């Protein structure tokens, strides 16, 4: 959408999430909403309204590939992008994730300008 395509951002720590919500509140997108984990992050997107997806590889209960598996399977948002935040960037995990059809990945910790690339790449690679 324009500047206010709706994000929900995943992440069981707190400070990530404001870290994320904060990086993209520069770059122009406001609508953002946040989830602690895998299961509380489908809860919420159930209400539909979301536009993206950035989510945290290691979380408790549900974790970032599980969570990505899922929203694929959901005929009603499997088309949704997902964003993978990871620490380190390991060949098979980055294999694993795009296989389960990860939009992209990003390397912690990163700024505005980086996340502003990852998510143009994404857009133009779907056709946004």
């Known amino acids: 959408s ?12 707190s400070t990530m999430r404001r870290i994320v919500r904060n990086l993209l509140k520069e770059l122009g997108f406001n609508n953002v909403e946040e989830a602690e984990d895998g299961v509380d992050a489908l ?32 005929g009603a948002m499997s088309a949704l992008p997902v964003l993978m935040v990871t620490a380190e960037a390991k060949k098979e995990n980055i294999i694993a994730a795009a296989q389960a059809g990860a939009s992209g990945y990003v390397v912690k910790p990163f700024t505005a300008a980086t996340l502003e690339e990852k998510l143009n790449k994404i857009f133009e690679k779907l056709g946004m």
């Open 43 to 74: 809860n919420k997107l159930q209400a539909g309204g979301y536009g993206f997806v950035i989510s945290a590889w290691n979380m408790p209960n549900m974790d970032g590939l599980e969570l990505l598996k899922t929203i694929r399977a959901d």
């Open 2 to 13: 324009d500047k206010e395509l709706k994000f929900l951002v995943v992440d069981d720590f």
